[PDB]
Design a protein around this ligand. Structure first.
Ligand code: HEM
Ligand SMILES: [Cl-]
Ligand SMILES: [Cl-]
Ligand code: NA
Ligand code: NA
Length: 105
């Protein structure tokens, strides 16, 4: 029953499920088009794009297919513990990443 989020190869949100709206505080329309780093606190925020670049040029996963409990940040600035699972998919020869987010609250 997790929240689902999809981003492109550059970290830009492409889909934001209903549950993601309730969890993070942004509407689907607002989230789409924004970098996924708006959902996290520092230092991950400023480093997330590097996380993605690192994976695309090495193909060495740290969270994909592994999973981790991390800290997410709501629209009102408050942080919470969440479990994160990530998958990779191709469409039109382009990479997209699918994320499942479980609020551990
Ligand atoms: C909401 C808070 C999130 C946090 C705190 C977060 C945190 C992180 C961290 C810590 C890493 C690097 C881990 C390491 O190098 O050991 C990472 C990697 C990654 N993140 Fe995020 N992330 C979040 C959400 C997402 C979402 C929703 C997606 C996908 C839709 C996403 C996609 C990725 C990708 C593609 C990687 C690189 C693959 C890998 O390293 O295995 N992240 N993230
Ligand atoms: Cl997992
Ligand atoms: Cl885990
Ligand atoms: Na938007
Ligand atoms: Na894990």
């Amino acid at each position: 029953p997790d929240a689902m989020i999809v981003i492109d190869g550059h970290g830009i949100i492409q889909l934001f499920s209903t549950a993601a709206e309730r969890l993070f505080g942004w509407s689907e329309l607002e989230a789409i088009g924004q970098n996924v780093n708006i959902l996290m606190p520092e230092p991950d925020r400023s480093r997330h794009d590097s996380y993605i670049s690192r994976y695309r040029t090495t193909s060495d996963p740290h969270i994909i297919g592994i999973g981790r409990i991390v800290t997410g940040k709501r629209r009102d600035g408050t942080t919470f513990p969440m479990h994160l699972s990530i998958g990779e998919m191709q469409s039109g020869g382009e990479p997209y990443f699918t994320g499942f987010v479980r609020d551990l609250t």
